[PDB]
Amino acid sequence: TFLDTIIRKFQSRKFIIANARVENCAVIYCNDGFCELCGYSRAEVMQRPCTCDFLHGPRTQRRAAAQIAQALLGAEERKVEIAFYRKDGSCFLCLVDVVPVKNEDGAVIMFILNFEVVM
Template sequence: MLIKPHQYRSFLVANAQPESCHIIFCSDGFCKMTGFTRAEVMQRSACTEFLQGQMTSQAVVQSIKEALRKGEEQHFEILYYRKNGEF
């Protein structure tokens, strides 16, 4: 079996304008990993509220929002949930 190097990458691309900051693309890997279809993800906020759950750190969520607002590159560790509620 031939495995392409990018076959298992999961990512989002968002509009970098602070006013909107909407998701404009998601990879097939992202859809497979989260259980959301591309249509369900497109145009949602890059703050990814739709992936957050009870155990998602609100402090990290606020840090993500701040980084998006400032247009800064940051690295975060955050617990996200799949569409079916699993994490």
């Protein structure tokens, strides 16, 4: 469990960790700050694609979602601003920070995604 080593990254941080070795980059961890941010519980978040489609609503731009998808096929850190929706229906502007995690060979094996509310 080196995932716990990564989990060590955990001040009001809101992030998820994704398994890049399955086709949809399923969520294999989400911290309490993230669940609290979006109003969904850990159980409602786990195993979903890390694109967080479940946070999509009317104001979510196709283009911003597309940037995140492209990032998840790359190997560089990327920052995308996107409109997300909490479980209660409220919309928050979000800066998503996609961070690739690599192995000794330099292959991407995970992503960490951090989320920050934007004004």
